[PDB]
């Protein structure tokens, strides 16, 4: 019965349901890490040259 | 000797894009001891340049020849006989771009830099073994001085 | 057991910068070296960067919960 691992047993919550915004670092909503991660992709290859 | 360039230039044309700043004139250039262009403005009440002027072009980082100081304030009532002015243009302003055609490597052979004289710009792109001591927001002089033959 | 903001907020900083300020004035104690001047709200913010304000604040939770923060504990923002 260890496919309720391998299906999630729900999505893992986001991280300003568990983990409050106010004094957990880095618990930013999911479109703001998108917007973050695209960021750091981009910046990576222009600070690069 | 703080020469960060130095070479002959040749003006082939004037304000091409078609912008004309009052007081302002625009000036692309090609080199002659090197294998570079020049875009310049100039002021052209106080230092007329018209298309045929040859002038050399020194670009320094302290004006001081008498070693590299590099003091910044500008005192008008202290002149010393080391100045870099036996040149008749004296300009000063900060480098605020260098840009190449790098593909995955490091300094390639077209480099430019970008240099912003108080609000008049210049663009000398050349060869990145011409252009070494360009780093971003460093403070360098231009001098200039018309040749006639 | 606190768990809220560490930071102080805007009014915070207006209620102590304001009873402090009055805890200047009335002929209240001052509690820092100071130049000579005479208005008790720059005494009461020239105080707060020195972080010698001894206050209290009870952040009450909507349950009726109050958690004790100092002054002193709270990281103000330049």
């Given at each position: 019965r260890r496919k309720y691992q391998k299906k999630a047993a729900a999505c893992p919550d986001p991280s300003l349901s568990v983990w409050r915004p106010d004094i957990y670092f880095a618990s930013v909503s999911e479109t703001f890490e998108t917007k973050v991660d695209d960021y750091s992709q981009e910046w990576a290859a222009q600070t690069e040259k | 000797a703080g020469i960060l360039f130095e070479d002959i230039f040749d003006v082939k044309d004037?304000?091409?894009?078609?912008?004309?700043?009052?007081?302002?004139?625009?000036?692309?250039?090609?080199?002659?001891?090197?294998?570079?262009?020049?875009?310049?403005?100039?002021?052209?009440?106080?230092?007329?340049?018209?298309?045929?002027?040859?002038?050399?072009?020194v670009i320094a980082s302290t004006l001081y020849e008498d070693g590299t100081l590099d003091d910044g304030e500008?005192?008008?009532?202290?002149?010393?006989?080391?100045?870099?002015?036996?040149?008749?243009?004296?300009?000063?302003?900060?480098?605020?771009?260098?840009?190449?055609?790098?593909?995955?490597?490091?300094?390639?052979?077209?480099?430019?830099?970008?240099?912003?004289?108080?609000?008049?710009?210049?663009?000398?792109?050349?060869?990145a073994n011409n252009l070494h001591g360009f780093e971003v927001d460093s403070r360098v002089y231009l001098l200039m001085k018309k040749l006639a033959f | 057991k606190r768990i809220t903001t560490p930071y102080m907020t805007k009014?915070?900083?207006?209620?102590?910068?304001?009873?402090?300020?009055?805890?200047i004035?009335?002929?209240?104690?001052?509690?820092?070296?100071?130049?000579?001047?005479?208005?008790?709200?720059?005494?009461?913010?020239?105080?707060?960067?020195?972080?010698?304000?001894?206050?209290?604040?009870?952040?009450?939770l909507p349950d009726g919960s109050y958690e004790d923060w100092g002054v002193d504990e709270l990281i103000i923002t330049d």
């Open positions: - | 004037i304000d091409p894009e078609g912008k004309k700043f009052d007081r302002v004139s625009r000036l692309h250039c090609e080199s002659e001891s090197f294998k570079m262009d020049l875009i310049l403005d100039v002021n052209i009440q106080i230092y007329p340049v018209d298309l045929g002027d040859k002038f050399r072009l500008y005192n008008p009532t202290d002149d010393r006989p080391s100045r870099a002015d036996q040149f008749e243009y004296v300009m000063y302003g900060k480098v605020y771009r260098i840009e190449g055609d790098e593909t995955s490597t490091e300094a390639a052979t077209r480099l430019s830099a970008y240099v912003s004289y108080g609000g008049l710009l210049m663009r000398l792109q050349g060869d | 009014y915070e900083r207006a209620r102590v910068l304001g009873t402090r300020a009055l805890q004035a009335m002929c209240a104690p001052v509690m820092v070296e100071l130049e000579g001047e005479t208005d008790p709200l720059l005494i009461a913010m020239k105080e707060l960067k020195a972080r010698k304000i001894p206050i209290i604040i009870r952040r009450y």
